[PDB]
Structure formats: C-alpha cells, structure tokens
Amino acid sequence: LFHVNKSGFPIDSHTWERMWMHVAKVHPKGGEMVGAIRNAAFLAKPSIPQVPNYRLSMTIPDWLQAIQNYMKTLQYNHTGTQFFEIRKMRPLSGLMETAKEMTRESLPIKCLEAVILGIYLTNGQPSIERFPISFKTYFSGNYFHHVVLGIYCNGRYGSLGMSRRAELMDKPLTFRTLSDLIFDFEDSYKKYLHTVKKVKIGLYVPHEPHSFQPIEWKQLVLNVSKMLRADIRKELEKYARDMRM
Amino acid sequence: SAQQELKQRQRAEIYALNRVMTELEQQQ
C-alpha cells in the first residue's frame, strides 16, 4: 500500500499521521522509533544539495553523472508516502513546475518523480534525447511497476532513474543499442528474482519546458516474459531506428 | 514566517525517518 501526498506543503495532519502509522507497523521497533523522531526537541536540519549546473568543462557522461548524484543526494523515498504527485497524462509544462518544486522542497523521491526531474535537468542540452522506459515485473506472487528515463546521445544509450536497487536506475552512456540497455535491466532484475512481464518505450520528450504536450509512455509495449530475446531485440531495434529517424 | 518553520521541521523528520527506513530495507 503506497500513499501520494495530495495536501501540498506543509503535509496535512491526515497524511502525516498515516505515514507515521505505516512506518510504526512495517518497522519492528515501531513506536519507540517514531517517538524518538517526533518528540525530539532538537532535530538536525539536513543539508539542501545544490541543483547541478551544466558547464563547458563537462562531457555529456559528466553532466548525466552530476544529475544522477543530485537524485541520489535527495535519496530514495522509503517512507511509503510519495511527497510530490506525478500525473502521467499532464502537459509537460505542468510537470516541469512540479520538477522545480522538487528542487525547492528538496525531499526524497521515487522512480516517477526521478524521471520528471531527469527531463527537467536535461531540457537545456539538445544533443541529449530523453524517453521513459517502463517495466512491469513479477516477484513472489505480486506485480511491480518501475520507470527509468532512457537517454540517447551520440550513438549510445543510457538511463537516469531512482530505485531502492543500485542496478535498476542509472546506466552509463555505453550501450550501442536500445536492446543492450533493456537486456541489462532484465539481467539486473534477475539478481532480485524478478521476471520482466512488460517493457514500455515512450517517445522522445520535447526540450521545450512550457510544452502543451503530455509525455508518451507507451509507443511500444512488449510481453518480454513470453518472448525470446531475438524477437524482443527485433522489435526494440525497429522502434529505436524510428525514434532516431 | 511560521509556515516555513513547520516545513523545515517536517523535512528534518522526513530525512530522520528516511535514514531509519533505508536501514530497515537494507536488513530485510
């Protein structure tokens, strides 16, 4: 059960208590842990990381690493309450405002928030093409949903993202094909005994921050659990060729 | 002025709680 904050900032008492009741149940130390934080008269102010800025002294791999590092400093959100609401069908202009709000509130983010932030921080670099990569996976009788931000620059594929697993987020710009990047996520999921049920490739996200256009999250959908790799490759390669055309 | 104070308290608790939950997930 995952909650999304629909109260803005400061978080309302209803959402705030619900988050605390959730962490007290999931945690074996429960109330002792909760009281230690909530009743502490003095709590140390966490540092606000600086929003990274693109410099001519940087290569595209350097700039992507700086963006990823900022996302890592914000931290993966393990509270069970997602702080910023991401409406997938929303025009990009709206989502860029939420991206700016994330840099101002400076709180932990989940996978979706990280994709929107990644788009936001790469809008100014025209050689970098961005597109969402969505996975529906299976593990221990349940389905999981995850999103990363696919990158294409100078004949190489990579990704930016946030996940609780180090191998399911950022990938360096070394993949010669889209298929190599996807297959790497599939092999990375394997480490966690997940079966990739679906792969969804969206369209290249416009670089215009005030775009009326929503993000396209599913131009290509593949049932990779029912397919052989030669066929997943064929499909992914036909589509990536079209993206570059 | 009082409004930004609750946000600063909530952020300090969010990161204090997130440090704890990361560690819990690390174990489990």
Are A75 and B11 an interchain contact pair (Cβ–Cβ within 8 Å)? no
The residue to which tokens 């049932």 are assigned: A223
Burial class (CB in 10 A: 0-12, 13-18, 19+), A242: exposed
What SS3 class is residue B23?
Answer: helix
Range of B5's domain?
1-28
Question: What is the DSSP annotation of chain A?
Answer: --EE--S-SSPPHHHHHHHHHHHHHHSTTHHHHHHHHHT-S--PPPP-PPPP---TT--HHHHHHHHHHHHHHH-B--SSEESS---TTSBHHHHHHHHHHHHHH---B-HHHHHHHHHHHHTT-TT-EEEEEEEEEEETTEEEEEEEEEEEETTEEEEE---SSTTSS-EEEEESSHHHHHHHHHHHHHTTT-EEEEEEE-PPPPS-TT-SPBP---SEEE-TTTS-HHHHHHHHHHHHHHHH-
Token digits of residue A86: 């991401």
A63 C-beta neighbours (distance < 10 Å), count? 20
Q: Strand pairing partners for A220?
A: A201
A161 close to A168: Cβ distance less than 8 angstroms: yes
From chain A, the residues in CB contact with B21 under 8 A are 23, 26-27, 78-79
Are B12 and A164 an interchain contact pair (Cβ–Cβ within 8 Å)? no
Of A78, A130, A126, A127, the C-alpha closest to A99 is: A130
From chain B, the residues in CB contact with A27 under 8 A are 20-21, 24
DSSP B8: H
The residue to which tokens 């005030």 are assigned: A210
Question: What is the DSSP annotation of A145-168?
Answer: EEEEEEEEETTEEEEE---SSTTS
Nearest CA in chain A to B7: A10
Domain count for chain B: 1
Nearest CA in chain B to A77: B18
The residues, any chain, with a CB within 8 Å of residue A55's CB and separated by 6 or more, are none
Token digits of residue A112: 């979706």
Q: Residue A168 is which amino acid? A: L
Q: Residue A75 is which amino acid? A: Q
Nearest CA in chain A to B3: A10
Are A78 and B25 an interchain contact pair (Cβ–Cβ within 8 Å)? yes
